[PDB]
Design an enzyme around this catalytic site. Structure first.
Site, PDB file in Angstrom:
ATOM      1  N   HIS A  18      43.894  35.882  37.960  1.00 45.80           N
ATOM      2  CA  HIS A  18      45.266  36.117  37.451  1.00 45.80           C
ATOM      3  C   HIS A  18      46.319  35.780  38.494  1.00 45.80           C
ATOM      4  O   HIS A  18      47.396  35.305  38.145  1.00 45.80           O
ATOM      5  CB  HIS A  18      45.458  37.572  37.046  1.00 45.80           C
ATOM      6  CG  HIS A  18      44.332  38.119  36.233  1.00 45.80           C
ATOM      7  ND1 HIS A  18      44.019  37.630  34.985  1.00 45.80           N
ATOM      8  CD2 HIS A  18      43.432  39.088  36.499  1.00 45.80           C
ATOM      9  CE1 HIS A  18      42.983  38.293  34.499  1.00 45.80           C
ATOM     10  NE2 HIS A  18      42.600  39.174  35.402  1.00 45.80           N
ATOM     11  N   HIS A  32      50.935  40.194  46.045  1.00 51.96           N
ATOM     12  CA  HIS A  32      50.618  39.002  45.286  1.00 51.96           C
ATOM     13  C   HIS A  32      51.915  38.428  44.757  1.00 51.96           C
ATOM     14  O   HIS A  32      52.982  39.046  44.916  1.00 51.96           O
ATOM     15  CB  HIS A  32      49.711  39.342  44.136  1.00 51.96           C
ATOM     16  CG  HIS A  32      50.308  40.331  43.198  1.00 51.96           C
ATOM     17  ND1 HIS A  32      50.247  41.685  43.418  1.00 51.96           N
ATOM     18  CD2 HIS A  32      51.022  40.157  42.060  1.00 51.96           C
ATOM     19  CE1 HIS A  32      50.926  42.311  42.473  1.00 51.96           C
ATOM     20  NE2 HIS A  32      51.418  41.402  41.648  1.00 51.96           N
ATOM     21  N   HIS A  59      53.851  36.066  41.351  1.00 51.27           N
ATOM     22  CA  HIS A  59      53.869  35.445  40.020  1.00 51.27           C
ATOM     23  C   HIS A  59      54.716  34.210  40.105  1.00 51.27           C
ATOM     24  O   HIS A  59      55.748  34.239  40.751  1.00 51.27           O
ATOM     25  CB  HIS A  59      54.442  36.397  38.992  1.00 51.27           C
ATOM     26  CG  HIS A  59      53.770  37.733  38.963  1.00 51.27           C
ATOM     27  ND1 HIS A  59      52.785  38.033  38.054  1.00 51.27           N
ATOM     28  CD2 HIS A  59      53.906  38.832  39.745  1.00 51.27           C
ATOM     29  CE1 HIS A  59      52.368  39.269  38.243  1.00 51.27           C
ATOM     30  NE2 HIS A  59      53.036  39.784  39.243  1.00 51.27           N
ATOM     31  N   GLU A  71      59.190  37.472  37.085  1.00 49.13           N
ATOM     32  CA  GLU A  71      58.988  38.448  36.000  1.00 49.13           C
ATOM     33  C   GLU A  71      60.301  39.144  35.704  1.00 49.13           C
ATOM     34  O   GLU A  71      60.798  39.084  34.587  1.00 49.13           O
ATOM     35  CB  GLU A  71      57.907  39.454  36.435  1.00 49.13           C
ATOM     36  CG  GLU A  71      56.563  38.760  36.648  1.00 49.13           C
ATOM     37  CD  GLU A  71      55.369  39.638  36.403  1.00 49.13           C
ATOM     38  OE1 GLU A  71      55.235  40.654  37.100  1.00 49.13           O
ATOM     39  OE2 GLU A  71      54.529  39.282  35.563  1.00 49.13           O
ATOM     40  N   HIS A 129      55.339  40.684  44.813  1.00 55.00           N
ATOM     41  CA  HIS A 129      55.143  42.102  44.625  1.00 55.00           C
ATOM     42  C   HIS A 129      54.320  42.667  45.736  1.00 55.00           C
ATOM     43  O   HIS A 129      53.140  42.301  45.878  1.00 55.00           O
ATOM     44  CB  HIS A 129      54.442  42.361  43.307  1.00 55.00           C
ATOM     45  CG  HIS A 129      55.305  42.030  42.139  1.00 55.00           C
ATOM     46  ND1 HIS A 129      54.813  41.759  40.882  1.00 55.00           N
ATOM     47  CD2 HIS A 129      56.649  41.915  42.041  1.00 55.00           C
ATOM     48  CE1 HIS A 129      55.813  41.504  40.060  1.00 55.00           C
ATOM     49  NE2 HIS A 129      56.937  41.584  40.739  1.00 55.00           N
ATOM     50  N   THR A 154      52.887  45.149  35.526  1.00 57.50           N
ATOM     51  CA  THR A 154      53.222  44.024  34.627  1.00 57.50           C
ATOM     52  C   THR A 154      51.989  43.274  34.128  1.00 57.50           C
ATOM     53  O   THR A 154      52.145  42.284  33.393  1.00 57.50           O
ATOM     54  CB  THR A 154      54.180  43.016  35.308  1.00 57.50           C
ATOM     55  OG1 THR A 154      53.505  42.373  36.402  1.00 57.50           O
ATOM     56  CG2 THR A 154      55.455  43.721  35.782  1.00 57.50           C
ATOM     57  N   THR A 155      50.791  43.749  34.483  1.00 58.95           N
ATOM     58  CA  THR A 155      49.520  43.223  33.955  1.00 58.95           C
ATOM     59  C   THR A 155      48.733  44.386  33.390  1.00 58.95           C
ATOM     60  O   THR A 155      48.937  45.525  33.832  1.00 58.95           O
ATOM     61  CB  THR A 155      48.670  42.555  35.038  1.00 58.95           C
ATOM     62  OG1 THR A 155      48.575  43.413  36.201  1.00 58.95           O
ATOM     63  CG2 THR A 155      49.331  41.229  35.496  1.00 58.95           C
TER      64      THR A 155
HETATM   65  O1  LIG Z   1      52.857  44.273  40.990  1.00 60.56           O
HETATM   66  C1  LIG Z   1      52.408  44.073  39.837  1.00 60.56           C
HETATM   67  O2  LIG Z   1      52.242  42.989  39.155  1.00 60.56           O
HETATM   68  C2  LIG Z   1      52.031  45.374  39.214  1.00 60.56           C
HETATM   69  C3  LIG Z   1      50.608  45.736  39.589  1.00 60.56           C
HETATM   70  C4  LIG Z   1      50.273  46.389  40.759  1.00 60.56           C
HETATM   71  C5  LIG Z   1      48.949  46.704  41.020  1.00 60.56           C
HETATM   72  C6  LIG Z   1      47.945  46.395  40.130  1.00 60.56           C
HETATM   73  O3  LIG Z   1      46.667  46.782  40.510  1.00 60.56           O
HETATM   74  C7  LIG Z   1      45.568  46.477  39.626  1.00 60.56           C
HETATM   75  C8  LIG Z   1      45.095  47.613  38.770  1.00 60.56           C
HETATM   76  C9  LIG Z   1      45.726  48.835  38.694  1.00 60.56           C
HETATM   77  C10 LIG Z   1      45.235  49.845  37.893  1.00 60.56           C
HETATM   78  C11 LIG Z   1      44.090  49.647  37.159  1.00 60.56           C
HETATM   79  C12 LIG Z   1      43.447  48.428  37.224  1.00 60.56           C
HETATM   80  C13 LIG Z   1      43.948  47.425  38.024  1.00 60.56           C
HETATM   81  C14 LIG Z   1      48.275  45.742  38.960  1.00 60.56           C
HETATM   82  C15 LIG Z   1      49.594  45.422  38.714  1.00 60.56           C
HETATM   83 ZN   LIG Z   2      52.861  41.628  40.211  1.00 62.69          ZN
END
Ligand SMILES: O=C(O)Cc1ccc(OCc2ccccc2)cc1
Ligand SMILES: [Zn+2]
Length: 258
Positions: free
Chosen positions: A62, A92, A94, A104, A117, A196-197
């Site tokens: 991703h 990371h 986007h 985003e 982020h 955001t994912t």
């Molecule tokens: O910064 C972002 O895009 C938000 C974001 C930050 C951390 C993140 O960690 C992965 C994750 C978190 C919780 C459960 C499963 C996977 C997922 C998204």
């Molecule tokens: Zn992010």
């Protein structure tokens, strides 16, 4: 789960496995600069990355994550809207297929080329997995990227991407200093939101810097050579891995600056 950013598995589909996709505090959002209000009570933001210990860089299919040692308070974010101490765990980005899209968050509907982020978790919850179950569990520092001059501090990241082209590939990534990714000013907007994912958990205090950083076309071009797919699968370029703006609903975006 088989979520992604394509026509068949993209943001419009996520709600079927992750119903919170249509929730009350989803991210990202458009930041309307003429509606966000200066909040004189916000305390100064404190980015303390002097002792940051980067470990590894991972293509997770991703994006790519640069991961840090978060076993102690080595790199932390405090102050601003935050109560207590938030520990840096990873960053990371986007980005887009073209320089006119990729971020985003948007600013008066403006899309930047990319968005960084820096993900931090609230140490009062003991670990990251526990923190994401809390409304104040995470603090994400969001930094816009525009295409212009190169960012010297990003080049080490750009140059390792060849070694993690495909999903599941990682590389050692020690001694990287995330201070080199910051703009001059720490003026910010803040609001309550979400990952955001998937799983899109509503556990984030967003802190989005007003000042973008400049990176070069060559730098962002190398982001776009990554692959969403695994090794020996058909090539799908890792581009347009951004979720569009979500309804603001009953939230106010506060500005740290007048
Ligand atoms: O910064 C972002 O895009 C938000 C974001 C930050 C951390 C993140 O960690 C992965 C994750 C978190 C919780 C459960 C499963 C996977 C997922 C998204
Ligand atoms: Zn992010």
């Amino acid at each position: 789960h088989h979520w992604g950013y394509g026509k068949h598995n993209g943001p419009e589909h996520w709600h079927k496995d992750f119903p919170i996709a249509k929730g009350e505090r989803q991210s990202p959002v458009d930041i309307d600069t003429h509606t966000a209000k200066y909040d004189p009570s916000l305390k100064p933001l404190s980015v303390s990355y002097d002792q940051a210990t980067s470990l590894r860089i991972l293509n997770n299919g991703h994006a790519f994550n640069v991961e840090f040692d978060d076993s102690q308070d080595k790199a932390v974010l405090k102050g601003g809207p935050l109560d207590g101490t938030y520990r840096l765990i990873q960053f990371h980005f986007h980005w887009g297929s073209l320089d006119g899209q990729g971020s985003e968050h948007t600013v008066d509907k403006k899309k930047y080329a990319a968005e960084l982020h820096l993900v931090h978790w609230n140490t009062k919850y003991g670990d990251f997995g526990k923190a994401v179950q809390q409304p104040d569990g995470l603090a994400v520092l969001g930094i816009f990227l525009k295409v212009g001059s190169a960012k010297p501090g990003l080049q080490k990241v750009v140059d390792v991407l060849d070694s993690i082209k495909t999903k599941g590939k990682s590389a050692d990534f020690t001694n990287f200093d995330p201070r080199g990714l910051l703009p001059e000013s720490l003026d910010y907007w803040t609001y309550p939101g979400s990952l955001t994912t998937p799983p899109l958990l509503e556990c984030v205090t967003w802190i989005v810097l007003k000042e973008p950083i400049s990176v070069s076309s060559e730098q962002v071009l190398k982001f776009r050579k990554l692959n969403f797919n695994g090794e020996g699968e058909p090539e799908e370029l890792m581009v347009d891995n951004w979720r569009p703006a979500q309804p603001l609903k009953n939230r106010q975006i506060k500005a740290s600056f007048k």
